Each structure stands twice: as C-alpha cells, then as structure tokens.
Amino acid sequence: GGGGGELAEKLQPMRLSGSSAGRLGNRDMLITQGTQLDCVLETRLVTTQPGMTTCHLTRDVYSTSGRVVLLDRGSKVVGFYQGGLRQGQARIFVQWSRIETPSGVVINLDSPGTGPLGEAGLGGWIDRHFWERFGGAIMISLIGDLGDWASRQGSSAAAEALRNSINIPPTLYKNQGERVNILVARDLDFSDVYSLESIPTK
Amino acid sequence: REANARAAVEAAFEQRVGAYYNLKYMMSGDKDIAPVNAWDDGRFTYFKFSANADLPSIYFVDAEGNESLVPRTTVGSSNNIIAVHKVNPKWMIRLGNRALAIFNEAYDPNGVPNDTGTASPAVRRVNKGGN
C-alpha cells in the first residue's frame, strides 16, 4: 500500500555516502585550505563603486610541513569587491584573486578576505546616510507645521519624500594600512616553481 | 650573442657604480613598526626592516600633508628591504593602527636625471618596435 502519506514521507531515509581518507602529495610544496595569510591593506576602501583592492603580505608563509617559505613577505595580493552593502550590513565581501611573489611566482588563489581575527568580509566605519534618508521628510513636516502655525496666528508630502529616499544603502569606509587576513579557500601547489637543495656544509 | 647581451645587462645592473647615498633620515611616531635603516640613492628610497618585524605599508606625503600610494618593490636577500620608486621629503609608515613618520633631512629637489630609461646609468632602454 501507498497510504500513510505524511508519516510515510517523514520516514524516508537520508542515506549519506561514506568517505575515504586520502593523503597529500608533497607537503613541502603545498599550502592547504584554511591557511591564514596576514597582509596589510594598501588601498583605502570605500564601497560606493565596485573596485579593486590591494594588500601586501606582512609575513612569510610556510608550507604545511612548515619547512619551506612558499610566499615571501612583501608579496602583492590583488582582489576586488562589488555589490555594495545592504541595510543592516557592516561588512563587505572581498575576493582576493592573485598573489605575486617578489621573485616572480604567480598563483591564482580565489579566496575570501576576512578581518584580523578571521571574521568574514572587511569592515570599517559605516555611513548610514541618516540625513539623506530622513531630512526631506523632517524638513517637509517642519515647514508644514510652521506654515500651519503662521496661518493660525492670523487672529502626505512627508510620506512621499520618505518613500523615495528611505532606501539608500550604507557606505563602508576602511582606512589604509589596516591589517587583514586571506583565508585560503583551495589547495595551492608550488611543485612546478620551487625545488630544494642541500647546502654544502662549511 | 643574445646570451652575451643579457649577461652584459645583468653585469651592468649589478655593478652599481658611481652612486651617492643619503642617510639623513629622522623618524617620529610608533617606533615598534620602525625600520632599522633608511636611505636613498638619489632615485629610490630604501627602508630595511628586521627579520622579526612585519612589513608595513608606506605612503607618500605631500606638502599639505595628504597621503598617496607610491609603488614599491621588495628587494634584499631575505626580502627585508622595501624600495619605493620616489625620493620625497616626508614618508608615512602604517601597520594596523600604528603610524610612523619618516623625514628626509637632506632632500635634494634636483636629483639626478634619468637619461637612459632604466634604473641604472649603464643600460639604455632602446625602441625595438620601430614603427
């Protein structure tokens, strides 16, 4: 039978496929997901228009084995943001796109930019445009009341103004020189550009 | 032959002869992000940072005090030197919420002209494209 429709559809199993452990190939030429890249913001960031950001690594980035410097300090990272903010948001999504090593190594990391403690997006000072959103309505109401008072002393436009200018998205301002992190979203492989050699002793 | 030309170009870049160095640099502000050495050769300004120091962001300060971006290259054996492509009386160093001002106390407005198109006086940049 096919009855018991509600109870029979709440009893449909959820079968999740198992996983098998693998192993990373070369952990000396590897930067894995979830590595934190600490860089200093060069450009001042204002989210009025879509644009491109730039930061420089403040520290050397080692491999997952922790033995080879894969990204040197002073490496330049280029990213971009778009879309602006919505009401109630205080952080913008920044995607870092490419990093250039001072020795000429280039890798396309397309990773999310975060704050100094890894919170998602870049955040700074927020301009909510209070006056541009409410000044028309406030001014219209006050002039209406003043005119009514003057007319009485002889012995809705405010809603229209508010409806048009109430929805102005906020603007984020982030100062130059601020510390940011790049959280690596994919595995970065440096096997094709570096190799190791032992130093002759003394 | 082209390998010979490339070797000559690299030798000319490395030889770095006839260079004058300006070491009159002062600093005020947050000394924890300060370089250990600053100088210029008349074309570029070099700030050297210690091994344990984070590399900060360096900004160009004009007469009115406005900051602006300046291109930089990282040089040195251990990437400990930031070379900025300008000589300026005042510099601004920022890392996070710490700031440090660098003052060139022997600023030469004239400088040395760049007649060759390269960073070295021993290499011409020549117009290959013709056209």
Binding site: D127 | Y25, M27, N37, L100
Partner: peptide, 28 residues
C-alpha cells in the same frame, strides 16, 4: 554631521635618527 574618521596621525615629539648604524647594503 558625521564624517569618516581619519587614520592616526603620529606624534611629532620623539624625533630621532633612523640609522643608528650604516647599512651593509651600502657596503659600509
């Protein structure tokens, strides 16, 4: 009535030489 805050301006009191020693890149 509210403007974006400026970055910190360094204090101009503790002005001291950057170079305590001659750099070795100058070969001196």
């Amino acid at each position: 009535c509210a403007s974006a805050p400026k970055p910190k301006q360094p204090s101009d009191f503790n002005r001291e030489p950057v170079n305590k020693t001659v750099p070795v890149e100058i070969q001196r």
